Design a protein around this ligand. Structure first.
Ligand SMILES: CCO/N=C/c1ccc(OCC[C@@H](C)CCN2CCN(c3ccnc(N)c3)C2=O)cc1
Ligand SMILES: CCO/N=C/c1ccc(OCC[C@@H](C)CCN2CCN(c3ccnc(N)c3)C2=O)cc1
Ligand code: NA
Ligand code: NA
Lengths: 97, 297, 245, 48, 245, 297, 49
């Protein structure tokens, strides 16, 4: 496992490190959206930051299951429950939870 | 565990596709057996019911009195490899000096063999085909003259950077396979494996490559199967300055180790486009010749 | 005893007293995908009786001037019953089909329909007539849904190929003096073990009159042709929300 | 897509915002075929 | 090691690190209807993975003044995914359920919810207050769908019975200082082997705060309660067209 | 036949409902065993986690030092039959001379035992109940006087014609069961089987009897289960002319061979209607008695 | 935090079917990846220069 830049938005030198992590914070209980990204590993986007994505570039075809492990780095006193979903081909970006 | 009867006795999950037919060795044409006059009631070989969908089972022996004939005529030349393993033209690439096309000393050809009717009509007899292939590249000037020029051919699979110039960094070809050869050398020749992500290439795909609304502007994607798109073939003259000669590269393909499924009607209208079966509606012609009357030769 | 038949599957039964046997396409029966041909890892769902049953989708009228029609599979069913719902909720689908085309008349009518199944039936256009225009068939023509679509040029099957050779595909004829239906069982045909029931039409059903309908004034002139079909061994995988296209 | 199932909850005294780091890799059934050149070429002019 | 848990069914997995074991209602697991208990003769359909999976249907906000809520089964799912479609296309339905109510806070919040399952939860009305009027609960109150419905008089569970005795039904408590969820597995409960998923609600899920939520100013005040549930051993029979009610 | 692995190994169809518990014989209260002082670490019987949903497993022996007690107190009187097989009033039918109700010498009573609170509160402790029953009919005048009058009781199952008069043709009772008895005779008494189409009667049905839109006007059908509607009980004085006496028929029921499932909270608000659990919203009273402070008796 | 990659597999996260995977791992060996000739040097021998 290598770090997946889910937060691939900042682009100025001084903010590059911010792409290595994304945030969560207290909300209003309406099952709000935290983040999204395509699962395509050999496509332009977050996966380019990973060593898998880069090695993938040296091959025309791939096959297999992928795995993304999310690590929470808030304080010990912070709790919470998230729903992480994978939508197979054909399904448009989910409008709601 | 299972307990209700309908579950124990169901056939759900049977992966063994039952087959009503099996192949037999047939290295020669069938022989003819002696037959004699038959004057029977009940027995009627000459009568069929074409509605069923099967072809007639009537044979020479049952329709006329035959002699014995030991037929040793071979069936070997009608195998798929016999029919397809003959190299034909499938691509032509021009590298002129003065021009409108590729005047910059390089060219990118999308690997698609449907631009030539002879070869295309043969492969389109089948819906799916799986095969390896031998590619041969014949190069010369537009007069067929052989000149002392060095060329580079490079296979650029989907996703690899397509050269955009005779001096593109992509020609470093560190992973893509490249061939360096002179027009003075014999035609270059290599073996290509079956590279599709699918189990077979298919000359017809009745569908769309993506999901969504299939509005007018995207209808050019009807029938587009990426499983058939193997990449780009790039060619350049090897130098930083323009070549002194105008060149032409003809591409021949010889399939080998062929397998094919689902035969279909053979094209009977001229081809117009590589990507589809469009035909000229104002020139729909009969499949073959015509005559003046049905009672006259 | 080959002229009579009963087809029972799911909660549906079909009877016919003027059949002409049954055709099993390419000589093989529908079957579920084996563990070695499969590639997708999720455990599939096999609804069985709720989706493998006969659906009567449409009726066309055979007239002395009719040119012929075609339907696409699995397109005709993507919006019908429980089969349609599974096709919409899942990315992957695979199945076979039992097709039963019905058309009866009287012993004084005549005519013959060719009923055939053509895998990967790609439709072409007339190219602006002159053939210089690269026009393409619209979505409603490539995937006409249950209503089907009428052939413009049956002789070349709207795709530059001779209908005279269509018999190289699984077929039966409905010749009025002989039978009143055609029955064809088709296995799953594709270069992949599963595919999208939405983006890909595995085969087309063609019903074309080759010998025109005829009868004398006074005989019932309305001669319907009805299309009934049943999915066999339906399997679905890749679950998520329903999508219509 | 990542959604809030309940909510990020914290008591008095702890930060109201925290971050998540994502790590990715392939499963053991993953393989690749048809060797090709990468889409990038990390050089502008000649490397001296 | 009893505080941690993973629930995997279908293509869905739930995790929790502050559980309080699992309750199996009336001590028995869901099972399919046996051939001797059954009465209907058509072969049922058992979709398996496409319908027996976790569906997260709704989130409520727990406030210091909340009175409590209830949901009806199988009502909450009759319009969701493949399960809903089968429930609509079929007359007969039967299944069990795995219910997972989620609610987390901080080690400085407090409060306790009673999570219980009450079979045949018939709702009553206040009878015009004076009790002389024979009023009846409207459809939206007896079968509230996914949004659930808020109790007007929790002390008598809006049905003239003491909530203090609700613990005689399969339950768990979500006491914030201890756990952040409740998990209850319920078998099919009825006097018949199958029934209408539309006309009959086998049981109700009650989530009621017994010890009010409390916390000091400054602590996250938004404390959601989310309802996730999975059908188990779903069976359907009596196929025909889809009906919503 | 089956071949794909996931099919062979699935549990789809298992009709054997696995049970986490089993019954044990318990004819007497449990005994008490000698216990002594325990001063341990790790062992903590007094501490529980009520959140789990189970009741405390702590016993006398582990909380205090106990002596041995051989308990022979019986558990026999708390069985379902012990509790329910006691006849109670469930119906009352008036046959007055001068009146507004049934002044025509006959009456039809819908078989519904929920009109009397004592009996009703006992049965509503359970959701489903299956039982046979013994019915006893006590008849006299409104003063409790016994008069020389002949009566006819007839059970009219759903679908049979309900008498509409003291002289109805339906009293021919050719198939329905009838009882002829005098008020001077002892109370009539018969045995009734479990007659529902369901496996059990149910005192609560959270649903509707039919499909369709459940608009306001039909909301009186919420909770109506025909499986609980066994018919009508008809009574008449046997004659073509009016009876000389005003009568009353009290109906008692004694269940026997009882089975019950799904216990539930017991009613704590007065009952208002037979058909539902409606309670008087302006008089919601505590389940029991109250006091002034939590620190005072 | 331990520094190891996840040990979770398809089988434990969702209900899977059986799949006999015969996809080769041969093209990702070091020789497969590196034994492809690439340009590494250019030498000019001009006349005028
Ligand atoms: C130095 C390196 O030298 N490299 C040489 C070299 C040669 C060939 C090559 O790939 C050959 C691919 C052909 C074998 C098959 C072409 N195919 C498949 C089906 N298809 C279809 C299907 C449906 N519609 C259309 N239009 C087209 C089609 O065109 C790659 C590299
Ligand atoms: C000469 C012939 O003498 N014949 C005597 C005779 C006596 C009794 C009789 O049938 C007795 C039926 C009872 C045993 C059960 C009554 N039950 C079942 C559940 N139920 C419910 C359930 C839910 N809501 C309401 N409101 C009511 C209810 O009231 C038939 C015939
Ligand atoms: Na597709
Ligand atoms: Na019902």
């Amino acid at each position: 496992e290598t770090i997946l830049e889910v937060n691939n938005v900042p682009t100025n030198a001084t903010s590059l490190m911010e792409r290595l992590r994304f945030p969560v914070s207290a909300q209003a209980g309406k099952g709000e959206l935290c983040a999204v990204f395509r699962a395509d590993p050999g496509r332009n986007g977050p996966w380019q930051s990973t060593l898998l994505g880069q090695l993938c570039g040296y091959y025309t075809q791939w096959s297999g299951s992928l795995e993304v492990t999310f690590m929470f780095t808030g304080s010990f006193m912070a709790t919470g429950k998230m729903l992480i979903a994978y939508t197979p081909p054909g399904g448009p970006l989910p409008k709601d939870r | 565990g299972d307990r209700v009867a309908d579950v124990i006795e169901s056939s759900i999950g049977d992966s063994v596709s039952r087959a009503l037919t099996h192949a037999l060795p047939a290295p020669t044409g069938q022989n003819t057996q002696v037959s004699s006059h038959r004057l029977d009631t009940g027995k009627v070989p000459a009568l069929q019911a074409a509605e069923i969908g099967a072809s007639s089972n009537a044979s020479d022996e049952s329709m006329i009195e035959t002699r014995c004939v030991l037929n040793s005529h071979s069936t070997a030349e009608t195998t798929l490899d016999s029919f397809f393993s003959r190299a034909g033209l499938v691509g032509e690439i021009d590298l002129p000096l003065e021009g409108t096309t590729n005047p910059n000393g390089y060219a990118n050809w999308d690997i698609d063999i449907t631009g030539y009717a002879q070869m295309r009509r043969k492969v389109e007899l089948f819906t799916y085909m799986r095969f390896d292939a031998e590619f041969t590249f014949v190069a010369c000037t537009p007069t067929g003259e052989v000149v002392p020029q060095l060329l580079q051919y490079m296979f650029v699979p989907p996703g690899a950077p397509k050269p955009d110039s005779r001096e593109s960094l992509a020609w470093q070809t560190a992973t893509n396979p490249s061939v360096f050869v002179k027009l003075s050398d014999p035609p270059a020749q290599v073996s290509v494996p079956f590279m599709s992500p699918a189990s077979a290439y298919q000359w017809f795909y009745d569908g769309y490559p993506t999901f969504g609304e299939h509005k007018q502007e995207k209808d050019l994607e009807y029938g587009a199967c990426p499983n058939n798109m193997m990449g780009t073939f790039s060619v350049r003259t090897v130098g930083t300055s323009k070549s002194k000669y105008p060149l032409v590269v003809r591409i021949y393909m010889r399939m080998k180790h062929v397998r094919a499924w689902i035969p279909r009607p053979m094209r009977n209208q001229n081809y117009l486009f590589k990507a589809n079966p469009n035909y000229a509606g104002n020139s729909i012609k009969p499949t073959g010749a015509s005559r003046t009357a049905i009672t006259t030769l | 005893s080959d002229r009579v038949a009963q087809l029972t599957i799911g909660n549906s039964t079909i009877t016919t007293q003027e059949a002409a046997n049954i055709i099993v396409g390419y000589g093989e029966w529908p079957s579920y995908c084996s563990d070695s041909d499969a590639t997708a890892v999720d455990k599939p769902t096999r609804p069985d009786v709720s989706v493998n049953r006969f659906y009567t989708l449409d009726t066309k009228l055979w007239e002395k001037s009719s040119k012929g029609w075609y339907w696409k599979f699995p397109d005709v069913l993507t919006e019908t019953g429980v089969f349609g719902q599974n096709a919409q909720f899942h990315y992957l689908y695979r199945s076979g089909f039992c097709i039963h085309v019905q058309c009866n008349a009287s012993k004084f009518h005549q005519g013959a329909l060719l009923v055939a199944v053509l895998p990967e039936y790609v439709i072409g256009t007339v190219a602006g007539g002159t053939g210089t225009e690269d026009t393409h068939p619209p979505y409603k023509q490539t995937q006409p849904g249950a209503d089907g679509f009428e052939l413009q040029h049956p002789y070349v099957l709207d795709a530059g190929i001779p209908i005279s050779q269509l018999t190289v595909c699984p077929h039966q004829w409905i010749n009025l003096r002989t039978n009143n239906c055609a029955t064809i069982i088709v296995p799953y045909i594709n270069a992949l073990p599963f595919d999208s029931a939405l983006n890909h039409c595995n085969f087309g059903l063609l019903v074309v009159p080759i010998s025109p309908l005829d009868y004398d004034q006074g005989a019932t002139p309305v001669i319907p042709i009805t299309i009934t079909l049943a999915p066999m061994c339906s399997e679905f995988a890749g679950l998520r929300q329903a999508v219509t296209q | 897509s990542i959604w809030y199932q309940t909510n990020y909850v914290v008591p008095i005294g702890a930060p109201n915002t925290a971050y998540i780091i994502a790590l990715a890799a392939a499963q053991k059934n993953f393989t690749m075929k048809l060797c090709k050149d990468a889409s990038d070429i990390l050089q502008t002019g000649t490397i001296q």
